[PDB]
Design a protein around this motif. Structure first.
Motif, PDB file in Angstrom:
ATOM      1  N   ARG A  64      94.210   5.773  61.174  1.00  0.00           N
ATOM      2  CA  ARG A  64      94.118   7.241  61.270  1.00  0.00           C
ATOM      3  C   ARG A  64      95.306   8.000  60.731  1.00  0.00           C
ATOM      4  O   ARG A  64      95.184   9.141  60.242  1.00  0.00           O
ATOM      5  N   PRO A 116      91.894  17.013  66.870  1.00  0.00           N
ATOM      6  CA  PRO A 116      90.719  16.214  67.243  1.00  0.00           C
ATOM      7  C   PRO A 116      89.392  16.906  67.040  1.00  0.00           C
ATOM      8  O   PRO A 116      89.268  18.024  66.543  1.00  0.00           O
ATOM      9  N   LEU A 117      88.353  16.243  67.502  1.00  0.00           N
ATOM     10  CA  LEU A 117      86.986  16.758  67.430  1.00  0.00           C
ATOM     11  C   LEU A 117      86.927  18.136  68.072  1.00  0.00           C
ATOM     12  O   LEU A 117      87.505  18.320  69.170  1.00  0.00           O
ATOM     13  N   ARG A 131      88.837  21.787  73.583  1.00  0.00           N
ATOM     14  CA  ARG A 131      88.417  20.965  74.679  1.00  0.00           C
ATOM     15  C   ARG A 131      88.540  21.688  76.003  1.00  0.00           C
ATOM     16  O   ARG A 131      89.594  22.248  76.388  1.00  0.00           O
ATOM     17  N   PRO A 148      81.735   9.972  61.482  1.00  0.00           N
ATOM     18  CA  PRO A 148      81.966   8.762  62.296  1.00  0.00           C
ATOM     19  C   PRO A 148      82.214   9.014  63.775  1.00  0.00           C
ATOM     20  O   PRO A 148      81.908   8.197  64.655  1.00  0.00           O
ATOM     21  N   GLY A 169      77.355  11.400  65.191  1.00  0.00           N
ATOM     22  CA  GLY A 169      76.192  10.513  65.089  1.00  0.00           C
ATOM     23  C   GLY A 169      76.315   9.238  64.277  1.00  0.00           C
ATOM     24  O   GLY A 169      75.539   8.335  64.582  1.00  0.00           O
ATOM     25  N   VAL A 185      87.067   2.369  68.841  1.00  0.00           N
ATOM     26  CA  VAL A 185      86.067   1.365  69.193  1.00  0.00           C
ATOM     27  C   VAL A 185      84.810   2.283  69.248  1.00  0.00           C
ATOM     28  O   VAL A 185      84.770   3.209  70.075  1.00  0.00           O
ATOM     29  N   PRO A 186      83.832   2.058  68.363  1.00  0.00           N
ATOM     30  CA  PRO A 186      82.653   2.940  68.304  1.00  0.00           C
ATOM     31  C   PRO A 186      81.724   2.782  69.502  1.00  0.00           C
ATOM     32  O   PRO A 186      81.604   1.673  69.957  1.00  0.00           O
ATOM     33  N   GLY A 206      83.620   6.395  74.914  1.00  0.00           N
ATOM     34  CA  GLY A 206      84.316   7.646  75.046  1.00  0.00           C
ATOM     35  C   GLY A 206      83.356   8.842  74.815  1.00  0.00           C
ATOM     36  O   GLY A 206      82.218   8.721  74.319  1.00  0.00           O
ATOM     37  N   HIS A 207      83.848  10.008  75.187  1.00  0.00           N
ATOM     38  CA  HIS A 207      83.033  11.238  75.034  1.00  0.00           C
ATOM     39  C   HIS A 207      83.879  12.483  75.214  1.00  0.00           C
ATOM     40  O   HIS A 207      84.838  12.472  76.005  1.00  0.00           O
ATOM     41  N   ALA A 208      83.545  13.561  74.530  1.00  0.00           N
ATOM     42  CA  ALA A 208      84.371  14.729  74.740  1.00  0.00           C
ATOM     43  C   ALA A 208      84.133  15.363  76.106  1.00  0.00           C
ATOM     44  O   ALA A 208      84.998  16.057  76.621  1.00  0.00           O
ATOM     45  N   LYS A 216      94.641   5.747  76.647  1.00  0.00           N
ATOM     46  CA  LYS A 216      94.514   6.952  75.837  1.00  0.00           C
ATOM     47  C   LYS A 216      93.157   7.689  76.051  1.00  0.00           C
ATOM     48  O   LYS A 216      93.065   8.938  76.149  1.00  0.00           O
ATOM     49  N   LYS A 255      90.085   9.421  77.622  1.00  0.00           N
ATOM     50  CA  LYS A 255      89.874  10.042  78.920  1.00  0.00           C
ATOM     51  C   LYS A 255      88.620   9.438  79.592  1.00  0.00           C
ATOM     52  O   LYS A 255      88.504   9.341  80.818  1.00  0.00           O
ATOM     53  N   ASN A 256      87.615   9.068  78.821  1.00  0.00           N
ATOM     54  CA  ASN A 256      86.383   8.525  79.323  1.00  0.00           C
ATOM     55  C   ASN A 256      86.289   7.123  78.747  1.00  0.00           C
ATOM     56  O   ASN A 256      86.067   7.016  77.569  1.00  0.00           O
ATOM     57  N   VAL A 274      75.664   6.945  74.245  1.00  0.00           N
ATOM     58  CA  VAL A 274      74.392   6.572  73.684  1.00  0.00           C
ATOM     59  C   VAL A 274      74.461   5.613  72.461  1.00  0.00           C
ATOM     60  O   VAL A 274      73.610   4.728  72.232  1.00  0.00           O
TER      61      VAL A 274
HETATM   62  C1  AMX Z   1      83.725  10.766  71.283  1.00  0.00           C
HETATM   63  C2  AMX Z   1      85.229  11.047  71.046  1.00  0.00           C
HETATM   64  C3  AMX Z   1      85.546  11.647  69.665  1.00  0.00           C
HETATM   65  C4  AMX Z   1      85.729  12.032  72.084  1.00  0.00           C
HETATM   66  O1  AMX Z   1      86.961  12.570  71.626  1.00  0.00           O
HETATM   67  P1  AMX Z   1      88.054  13.301  72.588  1.00  0.00           P
HETATM   68  O2  AMX Z   1      87.290  14.147  73.553  1.00  0.00           O
HETATM   69  O3  AMX Z   1      89.016  13.835  71.594  1.00  0.00           O
HETATM   70  O4  AMX Z   1      88.530  11.947  73.324  1.00  0.00           O
HETATM   71  P2  AMX Z   1      89.720  11.842  74.375  1.00  0.00           P
HETATM   72  O5  AMX Z   1      90.195  13.129  75.012  1.00  0.00           O
HETATM   73  O6  AMX Z   1      89.421  10.684  75.230  1.00  0.00           O
HETATM   74  O7  AMX Z   1      90.824  11.328  73.337  1.00  0.00           O
HETATM   75  C5  AMX Z   1      92.110  11.001  73.866  1.00  0.00           C
HETATM   76  C6  AMX Z   1      92.714   9.887  73.052  1.00  0.00           C
HETATM   77  O8  AMX Z   1      91.962   8.658  73.272  1.00  0.00           O
HETATM   78  C7  AMX Z   1      91.542   8.123  72.059  1.00  0.00           C
HETATM   79  N1  AMX Z   1      90.232   7.486  72.201  1.00  0.00           N
HETATM   80  C8  AMX Z   1      89.143   8.114  72.742  1.00  0.00           C
HETATM   81  N2  AMX Z   1      88.025   7.404  72.608  1.00  0.00           N
HETATM   82  C9  AMX Z   1      88.396   6.259  71.909  1.00  0.00           C
HETATM   83  C10 AMX Z   1      87.708   5.099  71.471  1.00  0.00           C
HETATM   84  N3  AMX Z   1      86.432   4.859  71.616  1.00  0.00           N
HETATM   85  N4  AMX Z   1      88.400   4.162  70.789  1.00  0.00           N
HETATM   86  C11 AMX Z   1      89.690   4.378  70.593  1.00  0.00           C
HETATM   87  N5  AMX Z   1      90.447   5.411  70.948  1.00  0.00           N
HETATM   88  C12 AMX Z   1      89.746   6.326  71.624  1.00  0.00           C
HETATM   89  C13 AMX Z   1      91.345   9.389  71.236  1.00  0.00           C
HETATM   90  O9  AMX Z   1      91.049   9.144  69.886  1.00  0.00           O
HETATM   91  C14 AMX Z   1      92.665  10.107  71.552  1.00  0.00           C
HETATM   92  O10 AMX Z   1      93.798   9.480  70.999  1.00  0.00           O
HETATM   93  P3  AMX Z   1      94.884  10.378  70.183  1.00  0.00           P
HETATM   94  O11 AMX Z   1      95.568  11.153  71.267  1.00  0.00           O
HETATM   95  O12 AMX Z   1      95.885   9.499  69.520  1.00  0.00           O
HETATM   96  O13 AMX Z   1      94.113  11.333  69.336  1.00  0.00           O
HETATM   97  C15 AMX Z   1      86.070   9.764  71.242  1.00  0.00           C
HETATM   98  O14 AMX Z   1      85.825   9.237  72.546  1.00  0.00           O
HETATM   99  C16 AMX Z   1      85.823   8.729  70.158  1.00  0.00           C
HETATM  100  O15 AMX Z   1      86.502   8.795  69.112  1.00  0.00           O
HETATM  101  N6  AMX Z   1      84.891   7.812  70.365  1.00  0.00           N
HETATM  102  C17 AMX Z   1      84.592   6.802  69.327  1.00  0.00           C
HETATM  103  C18 AMX Z   1      83.505   7.338  68.375  1.00  0.00           C
HETATM  104  C19 AMX Z   1      82.131   7.515  69.015  1.00  0.00           C
HETATM  105  O16 AMX Z   1      81.663   6.627  69.734  1.00  0.00           O
HETATM  106  N7  AMX Z   1      81.463   8.657  68.733  1.00  0.00           N
HETATM  107  C20 AMX Z   1      80.131   8.920  69.248  1.00  0.00           C
HETATM  108  C21 AMX Z   1      80.081   9.996  70.346  1.00  0.00           C
HETATM  109  C22 AMX Z   1      78.592  10.237  70.747  1.00  0.00           C
HETATM  110  C23 AMX Z   1      77.855  11.072  69.700  1.00  0.00           C
HETATM  111  N8  AMX Z   1      76.798  10.543  69.099  1.00  0.00           N
HETATM  112  O17 AMX Z   1      78.365  12.128  69.332  1.00  0.00           O
END
Ligand code: AMX
Ligand code: AMX
Ligand code: OAA
Ligand code: OAA
Lengths: 435, 435
Positions: A162, A416-417, B44, B270, B273, B313-314, B317-319, B364, B366-367, B372
């Motif tokens: 990243r 971030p997002l 957020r 990425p 969706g 890791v795909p 996590g979730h916003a 790092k 939060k969730n 899904v």
């Molecule tokens: C979904 C989301 C973008 C949420 O973002 P957010 O609300 O900014 O997440 P957050 O408050 O937990 O992030 C805090 C930190 O944890 C990291 N973290 C969160 N989820 C993570 C994950 N699955 N893998 C690795 N690191 C992760 C964040 O990237 C961030 O690190 P940074 O401070 O260095 O930027 C994030 O959990 C993520 O990147 N998940 C992986 C991608 C994914 O699965 N996306 C699909 C979501 C569902 C959908 N279809 O929309």
């Protein structure tokens, strides 16, 4: 010798730290409040985004990295023998925050000429599109189709760390800006100059000049208008529909091509960039109904009918400006210098004396003054570019500079997002009590 | 006899008044505050939009017009001999707020079969696209190209009064939903079943079933999965990237086609969706590196390497969610009933016991729970749809239901242009003092 990428490499880490510390000290400081009316009102008046390239003052208008339009006119490098600023220079300023040298500016021009090249699948697609498909839709589809070439998409798929995202976004940004005029010019020729070719890029000219040559315009004043046009339409802070759309889509890690195409679908909205086209169509019905030299009383009647029919008067009002748009002023000034006796210009000038008054009388618009769209097409029409459904494409081409300059910074800064919380009317009623 | 348009005609004016009064009484009531961290953090935690169709609770997950997934499963009409809810019924619920009758549901199915028809320029375009152009990009470009058919675009151009906007948005919405599966299926066949045809719509089947037949799948359980899939991916409140993008673009008066295509460019990100596809590619490298039946210690190592390499890791996590996504649960449950011994399923199940722990350990996210996307592709792979770069297209097809149901309401309610104020770091420092 000149290399924007090396300059950004130095700038990045310093901004990163600055923001880090500030947030350490003020992250929890409150900058505003959210009311029911703001949520219902398209976030009107909510401070909701960080956007570095430009900031809009409601009274004064736009500032690009702190400089106003007049300032840019005065400070940015111009073409040899030119008077209008080169957009290449504006791009430099937005990205770095510094006024560039003419030497820097020419490097930008060469880089852009070097990277201008279209893949055949895009060419085919455009060439096969029907003539009733709107120019903006043709544009957005082409940019979407160009993503097969994304270097950011590719590096992401390869698992890049990243921290290096910005380097790939920068490359796609410079490639996209380079290609834009060729896509745009191809649309223009296919639709309005059927059977002709856009020709080739001359690595020796400025971006604006190669664009006008691909469009097929020879007039040197036209070249000057295009430089000015492309500079002024470049950016308008982050909350405007097109920039916010690019920002929001880019936040998900979609590539610059996908992010800009989405922005284009937002700019094609009548309440956004399509207003430039809408103004000319409204003016044409005007002069048609009323015939060329109208009386003031007849113009008022004409405006009232639009209002009374549940429609907007295009080119007037703004979500944030509260005074006449300096972009409008800047265009007026160009018209006064170059085409003062043009009848359409004269009509636009007359409306300036009437529309605001009518809007004030109606009492609904918060800003009764004109915006950039009320003065743009009139200038284009004068030089022979009378195809009004294509005007928004010019705005899109310009807008790439601003949104793409910020996109690099968004990724460099690790934003971030973008994901706010929504509410239903029912849930919100309960949160409060109801009403 | 059944006519959704007539039902909306009654519902509209009543909601209009309700909102009017509530705003009269509470428009100025404060619902929250904005901090520096929220502006820097992709909004957020900021309550920033009104979105009627669904609301997401951080603990409980999604509610569609007040109903949870289990509730929908239980209340929505099913296919004859079916167990999974028909998406047609979900669409009815989102739009009206009422659980439909099976008779209502079949009308929706016939309407959608009746309106499914593609113009030749779209067909050509798809047929001429290269195989290296991503399925989502092919999809977004096709929907953008379909706007030549927009009834809303046309009525706007004719000057229709703003009060009637919703009627035209409704028609484009029902036309778009009808056409989606044909566009999607055409992409599928061109890329993966070269030389074959999608065939024809059977006015006698449900939308899901005509889609699966165009995809070329015969398995009846596959039909059932598709109904469920299309229902659950339908909507997820308004702040998610794709719905917010459709909302923001639609606010400018761009047509439903342009608004949905832009949304698609946001869903292809990425972090949004595309994660569904990303999960399967990550799983495939996994089983490749480690080979099929891995030990827990080896899985942890594998996760740590991803994390340590600056990647996400795909599917985790979730916003906004703070617990395991009921959409994930709902899929697990389907797997346990139908493909319990599938090895990939087994792998997904094993990761549920490990990934969260690793994420918590890292500290790092939060969730640390799954979303899904972590469970969707595994089900698709089982039935033979192993083309992972196409999975996001399925999500897009489903997402049309939600965003389009809200789009009708946005225009009916007269929501204005979405246009928040932006700030630069420099300006924000000054607003406070700096840091
Ligand atoms: C979904 C989301 C973008 C949420 O973002 P957010 O609300 O900014 O997440 P957050 O408050 O937990 O992030 C805090 C930190 O944890 C990291 N973290 C969160 N989820 C993570 C994950 N699955 N893998 C690795 N690191 C992760 C964040 O990237 C961030 O690190 P940074 O401070 O260095 O930027 C994030 O959990 C993520 O990147 N998940 C992986 C991608 C994914 O699965 N996306 C699909 C979501 C569902 C959908 N279809 O929309
Ligand atoms: C630009 C904008 C959408 C701003 O919207 P806003 O911030 O919601 O405007 P506002 O707070 O003044 O609106 C208050 C009321 O005045 C009406 N009003 C505002 N500008 C109006 C105009 N030019 N003609 C008619 N009515 C107008 C609004 O539509 C609204 O009425 P409503 O309560 O019944 O919805 C609006 O001024 C407008 O519709 N202008 C006409 C279209 C146009 O010129 N767009 C181009 C903008 C520049 C750009 N390129 O993006
Ligand atoms: O500032 C806005 O909201 C719209 C505008 O004038 C622009 O984007 O140029
Ligand atoms: O809710 C979100 O932000 C993303 C998500 O899960 C969806 O859009 O389905």
């Amino acid at each position: 010798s000149t290399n924007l990428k090396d300059v950004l490499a130095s700038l990045i880490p310093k901004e990163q730290a600055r923001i880090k510390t500030f947030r350490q000290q003020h992250g929890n400081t409150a900058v505003g409040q959210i009311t029911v009316d703001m949520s219902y009102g398209g976030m009107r008046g909510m401070k909701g985004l960080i956007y570095e390239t430009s900031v809009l003052d409601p009274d004064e208008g736009i500032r690009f990295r702190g400089f106003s339009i007049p300032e840019c006119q005065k400070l940015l490098p111009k073409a040899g023998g030119g008077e209008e600023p080169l957009p290449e220079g504006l791009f430099w300023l937005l990205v770095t925050g510094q006024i560039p040298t003419p030497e820097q500016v020419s490097w930008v021009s060469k880089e852009w000429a070097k990277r201008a090249a279209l893949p055949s699948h895009v060419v085919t697609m455009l060439d096969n599109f029907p003539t009733n498909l709107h120019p903006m839709s043709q544009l957005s589809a082409a940019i979407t189709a160009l993503n097969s070439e994304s270097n950011f998409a590719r590096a992401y798929a390869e698992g890049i760390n990243r921290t290096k995202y910005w380097e790939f976004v920068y490359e796609d940004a410079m490639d996209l800006i380079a290609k834009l005029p060729c896509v745009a010019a191809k649309i223009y020729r296919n639709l309005y100059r059927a059977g002709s070719s856009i020709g080739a890029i001359d690595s020796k000219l400025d971006w604006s000049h190669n664009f006008t040559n691909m469009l097929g315009y020879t007039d040197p004043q036209f070249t000057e208008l295009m430089r000015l046009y492309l500079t002024i339409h470049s950016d308008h802070e982050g909350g405007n529909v097109s920039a916010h759309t690019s920002h929001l889509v880019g936040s998900a890690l979609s590539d610059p091509y996908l992010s800009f195409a989405a922005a284009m679908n937002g700019l094609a909205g009548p309440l956004h960039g399509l207003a430039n086209q809408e103004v000319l169509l409204w003016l044409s019905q005007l002069q048609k109904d009323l015939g060329a030299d109208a009386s003031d009383e007849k113009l008022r009647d004409y405006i009232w009918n639009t209002l009374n029919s549940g429609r907007v008067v295009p080119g007037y009002g703004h979500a944030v400006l509260r005074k006449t748009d300096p972009r409008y002023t800047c265009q007026r000034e160009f018209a006064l210098k170059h085409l003062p006796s043009d009848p359409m210009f004269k009509l636009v000038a007359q409306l300036y004396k009437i529309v605001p008054n009518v809007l004030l009388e109606q009492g609904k618009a918060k800003n009764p003054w004109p915006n950039v769209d009320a003065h743009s097409g009139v200038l284009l029409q004068y030089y022979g570019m009378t195809e009004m459904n294509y005007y928004t494409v010019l705005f899109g081409v310009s807008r790439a500079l601003g949104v793409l300059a910020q996109l690099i910074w968004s990724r460099a800064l690790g934003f971030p997002l973008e994901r706010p919380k929504s509410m239903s009317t029912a849930g919100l009623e309960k949160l409060s009590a109801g009403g």
